[PDB]
Every structure is written in structure tokens, then in C-alpha cells.
Amino acid sequence: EMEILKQKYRLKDLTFLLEKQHELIKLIIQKMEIISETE
Amino acid sequence: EMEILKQKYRLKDLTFLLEKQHELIKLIIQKMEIISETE
Amino acid sequence: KSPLHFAASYGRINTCQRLLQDISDTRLLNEGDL
């Protein structure tokens, strides 16, 4: 039970960090500027 | 079984978010402009 | 040579279009960089 709970906490931390990373990448796409491929 | 199924759902959500993040990063590489290192 | 490979590798369609439109002899598309 202790090992399974530790794995679950590791996965929860991975999930939280992935949400933060996804938000940061969305910000990168939102704020970056494009001057060559403007279609 | 319930704990294992919860872990499996967490991993599935991580996988889906990783696909979305990879697509966003591929878009970033596709749309970003480079004026210094054009080789 | 290298810029065309880089643009085609990462889907930079505008660069490929503006680079391959120079000549119609088609000497760049048929090459292998390593």
C-alpha cells in the first residue's frame, strides 16, 4: 500500500507539472511573433 | 483493483496531455521564425 | 542544401515555397544529405 501510494503521489505531481508546462507552452504560442509564415 | 484503475486513468490522461503538448511544440517549431541561424 | 532539408524536416512550408521557386531545373529536391 505504501509503494502504491508513493507511485500515485508521483503520478499526481507529474500531472500537476504537466498542467503547468502546458499552460506555459500555450503562453509561448500566444505571445510569440511570426513575421515569415503569415500565410 | 480500484487503485490500479485510478493509476491507469491518470496515466491515460498524462498520455493525452502529452500528445496535445507535443502537437503544440511541433506547431511552435513550424511557425517560429529564424533570422540569425539560417546557416 | 541544408536550409531546404531543415525547412522540409519541420514543415516550414513558406520557406520551401520561396526557396524552390527560383529555378525549374529541379536539381535540389533529388538529393540526400547523409
From Swiss-Prot, chains A, B:
A 1,2-diacyl-sn-glycero-3-phospho-(1D-myo-inositol) binds at residues 6-12. Residues 2-31 form a coiled coil. It is found in: Cell membrane. TRPA1 activation by electrophiles occurs though covalent modification of specific cysteine residues in the N-terminal cytoplasmic domain. C-terminal helices from the four subunits associate to form atypical coiled coil structure; this region is probably involved in binding the inositol polyphosphates that are required for optimal channel activity (in vitro). Ligand-activated Ca(2+)-permeable, nonselective cation channel involved in pain detection and possibly also in cold perception, oxygen concentration perception, cough, itch, and inner ear function. Has a relatively high Ca(2+) selectivity, with a preference for divalent over monovalent cations (Ca(2+) > Ba(2+) > Mg(2+) > NH4(+) > Li(+) > K(+)), the influx of cation into the cytoplasm leads to membrane depolarization. Has a central role in the pain response to endogenous inflammatory mediators, such as bradykinin and to a diverse array of irritants. Belongs to the transient receptor (TC 1.A.4) family. It is linked to Episodic pain syndrome, familial, 1: An autosomal dominant neurologic disorder characterized by onset in infancy of episodic debilitating upper body pain triggered by fasting, cold, and physical stress. The period of intense pain is accompanied by breathing difficulties, tachycardia, sweating, generalized pallor, peribuccal cyanosis, and stiffness of the abdominal wall. Affected individuals do not manifest altered pain sensitivity outside the episodes. Homotetramer. Interacts with TMEM100. Interacts with EGLN1. Interacts with the scorpion wasabi receptor toxin at the same site that electrophiles but in a non-covalent manner. This is Transient receptor potential cation channel subfamily A member 1. It comes from Homo sapiens. The gene is TRPA1.
Curated annotation (Swiss-Prot), chain C:
It is found in: Cell membrane. ANK repeats lie at residues 1-28. TRPA1 activation by electrophiles occurs though covalent modification of specific cysteine residues in the N-terminal cytoplasmic domain. It comes from the Eukaryota. Homotetramer. Interacts with TMEM100. Interacts with EGLN1. Interacts with the scorpion wasabi receptor toxin at the same site that electrophiles but in a non-covalent manner. Ligand-activated Ca(2+)-permeable, nonselective cation channel involved in pain detection and possibly also in cold perception, oxygen concentration perception, cough, itch, and inner ear function. Has a relatively high Ca(2+) selectivity, with a preference for divalent over monovalent cations (Ca(2+) > Ba(2+) > Mg(2+) > NH4(+) > Li(+) > K(+)), the influx of cation into the cytoplasm leads to membrane depolarization. Has a central role in the pain response to endogenous inflammatory mediators, such as bradykinin and to a diverse array of irritants. C-terminal helices from the four subunits associate to form atypical coiled coil structure; this region is probably involved in binding the inositol polyphosphates that are required for optimal channel activity (in vitro). It is linked to Episodic pain syndrome, familial, 1: An autosomal dominant neurologic disorder characterized by onset in infancy of episodic debilitating upper body pain triggered by fasting, cold, and physical stress. The period of intense pain is accompanied by breathing difficulties, tachycardia, sweating, generalized pallor, peribuccal cyanosis, and stiffness of the abdominal wall. Affected individuals do not manifest altered pain sensitivity outside the episodes. Belongs to the transient receptor (TC 1.A.4) family. This is Transient receptor potential cation channel subfamily A member 1. The gene is TRPA1. The chain holds residues 447 to 480 of 1119 of the full protein.
